[PDB]
Amino acid sequence: QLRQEAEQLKNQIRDARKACADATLSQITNNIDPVGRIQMRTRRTLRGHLAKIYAMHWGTDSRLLVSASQDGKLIIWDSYTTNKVHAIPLRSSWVMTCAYAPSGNYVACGGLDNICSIYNLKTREGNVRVSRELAGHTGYLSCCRFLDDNQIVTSSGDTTCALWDIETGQQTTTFTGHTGDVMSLSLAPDTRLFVSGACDASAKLWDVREGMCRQTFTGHESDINAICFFPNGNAFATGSDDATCRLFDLRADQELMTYSHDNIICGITSVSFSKSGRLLLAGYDDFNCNVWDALKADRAGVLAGHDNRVSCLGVTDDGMAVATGSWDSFLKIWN
Amino acid sequence: TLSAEERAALERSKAIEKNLKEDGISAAKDVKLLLLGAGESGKSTIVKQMTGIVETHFTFKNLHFRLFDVGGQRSERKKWIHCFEDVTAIIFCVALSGYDQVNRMHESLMLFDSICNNKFFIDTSIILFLNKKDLFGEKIKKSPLTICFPEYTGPNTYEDAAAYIQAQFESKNRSPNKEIYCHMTCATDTNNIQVVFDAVTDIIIANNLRGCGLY
C-alpha cells in the first residue's frame, strides 16, 4: 500500500484500451495497392570525415546538411555539388548529436561532455563562433532540436529532458518521468508537443507549455533508440535494439503495426518517414538500412552499403532525396 | 563548364579539404588510453601521478598521450561504450587490499570479465594495475588469509597470494593475440609512466608485426 492502487489503475486503463480497439489491422487496407519494389541508387558520396560519424540533419532549404563525427569536426555540405561550405572545430571531440536551426542561421551540437553548444553561422567577420554553452545537464547529451531561433529542446542521460532560453541561458522547463536514460526525441509539425524514448522501454509524449507528461506508451521489449513523427503530427514510430519497429497513435494509445522479420537480428539506429508517410525507413546494425511500407508491413526495399554501420538517416522537407551516414566515415545521397 | 562563383566556391572547398586532411594527419600520431577503474580504486592516485569526460594529455619521451577517464558518467556504459572502440589500450586498476567491504574482489573480477569479453572492443590489450601494496601486505600479516576466495590452498605470505590473485585476473581471457600487462603499485612509486610506456611500445610492435603479420 498504496502500490497496489497503481497496479489497479494500470489494470483498468489497459482493459479500457483493449475495449476501445478492435482492429486488426490484419485485413484492413489490403484493398490499397502495394507500392511494389522500390529501387534506390547512390547519387553522391560525401567523403570528408576521418572517423565514425554519429548524426546528421537537413536544412529547411533541402540543400544544405550538417554532419558530426568523432574526429571533433562539423561539416556543412552542399548536397547538390558536394562542396564543403564550413568546417567547424569542436572544443570536445566526443560529440553525439547535431541539429540545424529552421532559420538556417544557427547550428547546435553536443555529446559526452554534458553541455550543448550553439554556433552562429551569419557573422560580420565571416567565421563561425560560439554563442552559448548550455550547461545544466548531468548525463551525456543525446539529442537536440530547435524550437525556433531562440528555443531548443534537449535530452540527456539524466533520464530527463529540458527546454532552454538561448539568450538567457537558463533551463525554463524540465521533464522528469522516464526513470531511465533517454535516447532520442522529435518535434511535432504543430511545434507544441514532442516525444522521447528511453532505456526504460517506454515512450512519453510531453506538452511544451504544461511541462508534464500526458501519454505513456509501452509494450516494447527493450531499449528505444530513435523516434520520428508522422507527417501530419498524429503518430510516431520507434526503433530499438530489439530488432523490431513499431508505431503508436496518440488518440488511440495503442500499438498499431509491428515491423519485424525473422532474418533480421540486430538493433535499429534511426527511423524516418517519407513526405507522404507511405514509406518508413530505418537503419540497422547489419550494415544496411531497410525500407518498410507504412501499413502493409513488408520490407519493400533495401539499400546497399555501407561497410558499417548505418547510424543516422534523414529525409529532406520536399522529400526529394534521402541521406545516410555510418561508422565508415561516408555519407550517401539516395534518390 | 561552371561559372566564376562556382569556381571560387570549389576553390574554397578544396582549401577546406586540404586543411582538414592535414589536421587529421597531424592528429593521428598520438596514442589514446582509456582509464577504467572501479570505486575506491587508485585511479585517482594514478592520475595525480600523471562533470562529464575528463581529458588529460601529456608527453613522455617525445610521445604524446591522451588519457580519458569516464568516472563522472553515472549512466549505463552499454550505451556510449562504443565510442572508445578505436583505442590503443585500456588501463584497469583494482585493490588489494580491500576485499571484505561489499564483495570487492568479486565485483572487480566480474567487471573485468565483462569488459574483457565484448562484441567490439575485443582485440585491445589491457594494462592492469594492482595498487596499494602496503595495505594488502598488512591485511595478511594481521588478518590472514582469509581468503574471500575459498580453496586457495597456498601459503600465507606474500608473493603466493599476490601471484594467486594476479593469475586469477589473467584468467578469463578467451582471446589469443591480446595480452594483459600487470604491475604492482605501492601508491608511492614514480616509474609507472615507464611501465605504461613499455606496454604501449610492446603493443605498437605487436600491431606492426601484425600486418604480414605473420602474427
Epitope: 540543400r63 544544405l64 552542399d78 562542396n83 561550405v85 564550413h86 560580420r124 567577420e125 565571416g126 567565421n127 | 561559372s3 566564376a4 562563383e5 562556382e6 569556381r7 571560387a8 566556391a9 576553390e11 574554397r12 582549401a15
Partner: single-chain antibody, 233 residues
Framework: DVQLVESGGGLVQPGGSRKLSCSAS????????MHWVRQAPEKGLEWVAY????????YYADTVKGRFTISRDDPKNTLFLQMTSLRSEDTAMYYC??????????????WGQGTTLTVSSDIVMTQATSSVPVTPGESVSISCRSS???????????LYWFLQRPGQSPQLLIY???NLASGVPDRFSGSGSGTAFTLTISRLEAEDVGVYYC?????????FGAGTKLELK
C-alpha cells in the same frame, strides 16, 4: 568593427611608380577575396584587379595588365597594389572591397573609404537615362541593360546593385538581383528578366538620394553600368 582604411596615393609625375595599401581590421581577413575598383574623377566605376582567398587565382583588367600587380600578406592583414609606368588617365579614385564566395554568400558587401590619385568581347552594361526627377514619399524605378543574358544554367542571375550617396563610399543593396543586403531597409526590391532588369522604391525619403550602379558577375572581366542620379524637385 569591420573597417578598411587605405592611403598610398598622391601627386605623381607621369611614368612613375607607386604602391597602394589598405589595412583590414575587425574581420577574418585571411578568408576573403579582395578586389580593387577605380572611379574616375567625374563619374563612372570600373573593376581593376582581384586576388583569391588563398592567393591562388588572380585576374586583371585590360589596361591594367603588365603594369599593375596585386599582392596580399594574410598574417600582416594588408592588401598591396603596385603601380608602374602610370599613364595620364590612371588618375582616379580607388577602393578595396572584400568578398567571400560560398553558397548563399553576399560578395562586395563592404567597401573602404577610398584614396585619391593625381598625375601630371566583354559584356556591355547599359543604363539610361542618367537622371530622373522625384519627390520624397513616392515610388520610382531604375532600369539597367546588358548584352548577354545573365541567367546561368544554375538559375542564378548574377546582377548586383550599388548606391553611392554623395561624399561617401558606395554600398551594396541587391545581390543576384533578387536578394537584399543586411542592414538595408526593406522598401528596396529588385527584379528583372534574363537580359532586362529594374528596381522598385516605396516610400522614398531624403536618405536615399544619390547615384546607383548595376554590376554583373557572370564572367570576368567585371563590368559596371553607367551612373544614374536622383534629384529633389
Amino acid at each position: 568593427d569591420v573597417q578598411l582604411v587605405e592611403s598610398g596615393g598622391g601627386l605623381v609625375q607621369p611614368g612613375g611608380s607607386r604602391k597602394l595599401s589598405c589595412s583590414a581590421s575587425g574581420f577574418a581577413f585571411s578568408s576573403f577575396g579582395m578586389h580593387w575598383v577605380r572611379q574616375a574623377p567625374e563619374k563612372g566605376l570600373e573593376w581593376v584587379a582581384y586576388i583569391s582567398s588563398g592567393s591562388g587565382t588572380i585576374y586583371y583588367a585590360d589596361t591594367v595588365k603588365g603594369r599593375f600587380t596585386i599582392s596580399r600578406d594574410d598574417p600582416k592583414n594588408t592588401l598591396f597594389l603596385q603601380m608602374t609606368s602610370l599613364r595620364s588617365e590612371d588618375t582616379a579614385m580607388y577602393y578595396c572591397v572584400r568578398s567571400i564566395y560560398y553558397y548563399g554568400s553576399s560578395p562586395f558587401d563592404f567597401w573602404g573609404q577610398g584614396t585619391t590619385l593625381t598625375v601630371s568581347s566583354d559584356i556591355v552594361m547599359t543604363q539610361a537615362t542618367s537622371s530622373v526627377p522625384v519627390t520624397p514619399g513616392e515610388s520610382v524605378s531604375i532600369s539597367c541593360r546588358s548584352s548577354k543574358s545573365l541567367l546561368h544554367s544554375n538559375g542564378n542571375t548574377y546582377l548586383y546593385w550599388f548606391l553611392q550617396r554623395p561624399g561617401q563610399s558606395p554600398q551594396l543593396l541587391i545581390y543576384r538581383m533578387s536578394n537584399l543586403a543586411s542592414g538595408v531597409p526593406d522598401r528596396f526590391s529588385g527584379s528583372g528578366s534574363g537580359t532586362a532588369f529594374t528596381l522598385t522604391i516605396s516610400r522614398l525619403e531624403a536618405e536615399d538620394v544619390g547615384v546607383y550602379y548595376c554590376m554583373q558577375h557572370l564572367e570576368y572581366p567585371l563590368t559596371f553600368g553607367a551612373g544614374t542620379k536622383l534629384e529633389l524637385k
